[PDB]
């Protein structure tokens, strides 16, 4: 019976909530109460990357922490040398409505996607000297929001059809379709070991998926609105979610519940991007108020503020060595902060 | 200089890339962008045919003006997560079928099709991203509407309607109902044109509307707002 099934589901939810409450002997606030505050963080704009003529929607650092890719609505994917402000490549996309970009860990490939529901993967190292589209992965029935490279052959995408997918590029097929979200999935983050990945969707839920097996292991709730940004903790045992409720949240995988909410009364605008430094101490979140706020991860106190973007900060990334922080906003500029 | 030979050559390559980007940006700015929306079967495909997966792209050229029509009817996702990508388009072509005053939606009979069109129009016209963005309102299927009003009256769609059941007066009433959904009648302006299957002046109407929009935009840009 449908009523019996709903009652069983409600009972299981009650049991899960009871277990989570039982495991909550203390909180991250009191445990880190005696830790020294980080202090006033002031980051200066070392570089400003000019050349984009439309709103920047995506950005991804390379592994070497020098080359970064940027996607904006003018239909171009620009690869920048951050050390000396230069344009290595300018790939003209077929669809100008790009909402995500990815840099492969090796550096041989760059993926883009958007309202075409197609993950287009381009080859940077080619004997012809020009960037050529290696593959056009299709099969998603909704807009692509984020794509992350596992390696040079597998890519993980999230779409607006409430699904995520794992593609092998050499056949362009969906190896594993991750389903279970009710709303559109807007962000995904790969764990450092690249065995689990967390996807945040518009039903205010973040789900943790096993890549090899293919089912959702844990579901984290608590947000009052859509999750637009997700980012794994460097340890891989936590992650951070940004939402339109003007709050960030830190979820622990092993504790299977939230640990802290970063919020302030002066902030009403939603979070577009969320990233960590290479220590897990600083949570950098891009906000719609043309600002990028740096929180202390262990103490909810606001460590610092980055201003200098004239429009909404859409994308935000941190290099693998943690040297610099790239921020790209809707004012068609990328700023490298240090 | 403190620059190597290959560093200098890389700088030259970056300068060439910058020049190409500027050229393509000028070409793109010379274009006109239209976002084409419609309440499902609203005659949108018919007009798409007469001017010439996810987002459908259409390019045509009329009187030395290069248009770019974007159709997002196949997205079937949360519109609020990608409607901001079209902020700054030159115009929004909204297609409404006048034959839907009788037909009710397949999903439940309590909620009417022209009411769906009106709700979509309210969402798009009053959207925070489209405040100064003009709307070109196409009212399609006028022949079927004119034929059908004789049998069933307009009172079903509008109970408060009190007027003659002639084609002209009912069409004017529907147009007025659609233009009173515009909360801001000063920042934005609504162009209404009636079309059918055999109409051949729709592209001309769109051209006139976009020319007027361009005139307004460059009046704002020239300091004569």
């Amino acid at each position: 019976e449908l009523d019996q099934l709903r009652q069983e589901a409600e009972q299981l939810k009650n049991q899960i909530r009871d277990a989570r409450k039982a495991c909550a002997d203390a909180t991250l606030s009191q445990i880190t109460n005696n830790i020294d505050p980080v202090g006033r963080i002031q980051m200066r704009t070392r570089r400003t990357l000019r050349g984009h003529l439309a709103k920047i929607y995506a950005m991804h650092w390379g592994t070497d922490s020098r080359l970064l890719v940027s996607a904006s609505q003018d239909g171009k994917l620009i690869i920048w040398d951050s050390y000396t402000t230069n344009k290595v490549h300018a790939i003209p996309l077929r669809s100008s409505w790009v909402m995500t970009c990815a840099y492969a860990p090796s550096g041989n490939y760059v993926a883009c996607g958007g309202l075409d529901n197609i993950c287009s993967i381009y080859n940077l190292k080619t004997r012809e000297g020009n960037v050529r589209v290696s593959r056009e992965l299709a099969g998603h029935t909704g807009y692509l929001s984020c794509c992350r490279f596992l390696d040079d052959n597998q890519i993980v995408t999230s779409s607006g059809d409430t699904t995520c997918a794992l593609w092998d590029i050499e056949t362009g097929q969906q190896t594993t379709t991750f389903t279970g979200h009710t709303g559109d999935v807007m962000s995904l983050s790969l764990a450092p070991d690249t065995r689990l990945f967390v996807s945040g969707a518009c039903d205010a839920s973040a789900k943790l998926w096993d890549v090899r097996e293919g089912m959702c292991r844990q579901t984290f709730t608590g947000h009052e609105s859509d999750i637009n940004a997700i980012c794994f903790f460097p340890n891989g045992n936590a992650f951070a979610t940004g939402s339109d409720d003007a709050t960030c949240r830190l979820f622990d995988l092993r504790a299977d519940q939230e640990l802290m909410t970063y919020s302030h009364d002066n902030i009403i605008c939603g979070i577009t991007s969320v990233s960590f430094s290479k220590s897990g101490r600083l949570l950098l979140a891009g906000y719609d108020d043309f600002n990028c706020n740096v929180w202390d991860a262990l103490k909810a106190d606001r460590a610092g503020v980055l201003a200098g973007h004239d429009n909404r900060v859409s994308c935000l990334g941190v290099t693998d060595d943690g040297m610099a922080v790239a921020t790209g906003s809707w004012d068609s500029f990328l700023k490298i902060w240090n | 200089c403190t620059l190597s030979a290959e560093d200098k050559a890389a700088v030259e390559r970056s300068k060439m890339i910058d020049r190409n980007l500027r050229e393509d940006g000028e070409k793109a700015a010379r274009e006109v962008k239209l976002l084409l929306l419609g309440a499902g079967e609203s005659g949108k495909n018919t007009i798409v045919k007469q001017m010439k997966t996810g987002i459908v792209e259409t390019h045509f050229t009329f009187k030395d003006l290069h248009f770019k029509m974007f159709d997002v009817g196949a997205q079937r996702s949360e519109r609020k997560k990608w409607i901001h990508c079209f902020e700054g388009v030159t115009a929004i072509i909204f297609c409404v079928a006048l034959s839907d005053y009788d037909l009710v939606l397949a999903e439940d009979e309590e909620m009417n099709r022209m009411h769906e069109s009106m709700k979509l129009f309210d969402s798009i016209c009053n959207n925070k991203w489209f405040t100064d963005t003009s709307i070109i309102l196409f009212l399609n299927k006028k022949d079927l509407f004119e034929e059908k009003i004789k049998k069933s009256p307009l009172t079903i769609c509008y109970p408060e309607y009190a007027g003659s059941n002639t084609y002209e007066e009912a069409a004017a009433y529907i147009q007025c109902q659609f233009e009173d959904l515009n909360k801001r009648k000063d920042t934005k302006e609504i162009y209404t044109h009636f079309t059918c299957s055999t109409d051949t002046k729709n592209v001309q109407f769109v051209f006139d509307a976009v020319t007027d929009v361009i005139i307004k935009n460059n009046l704002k840009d020239c300091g004569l707002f």
Partner: single-chain antibody
Amino acid sequence: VQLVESGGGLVQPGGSRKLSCSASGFAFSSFGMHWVRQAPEKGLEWVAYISSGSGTIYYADTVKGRFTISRDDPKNTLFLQMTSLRSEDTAMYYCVRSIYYYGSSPFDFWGQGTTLTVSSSDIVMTQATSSVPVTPGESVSISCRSSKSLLHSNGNTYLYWFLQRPGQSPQLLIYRMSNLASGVPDRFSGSGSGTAFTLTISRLEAEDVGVYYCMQHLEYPLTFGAGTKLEL
């Protein structure tokens, strides 16, 4: 990728010729181009260079004024118009492509060249080895010394190793003194200390026999070494 070149022949001194380099299989416009001479029994010497989009043109000191190098991007071709020819220009000319960005590999593909005969402050790169014996399966080291430090302040040492097989166009091996080119087996390695550099082959076969050259790329008189020949 092909870089076939045309022209050459026997020219009386004081004349003029046009050397043509036809390119197919790659983007011409994004690639800078170089001309490199080869005397009948001697090493390689850089002649002329044009950047992408014909922005910058460089010539060697010994060929300044007389030669003029140009490109036709729509036709995908390279021209070298040569005037006031003397017996010092009798060489096997080589058309070389070179792209320049971060992490790029300049001097990838060398054309087959054209034979041309005439009727009768730069960095010094020296390889004193000249000729060293080789046995298959062994490991060999080839040394190249520089007049000034090839290490630029940015951290990129600018040294290129080329292998010219008997009766073959030169082939890039190492770019920037430690980076292996595409299609080159991993047995090749490069090391250096700013001025003196070595290139090591772990296990050679008959395919590795040839003459090895070292090029600098710091300033732009591009100078090669004397070369070191391997004989089994």
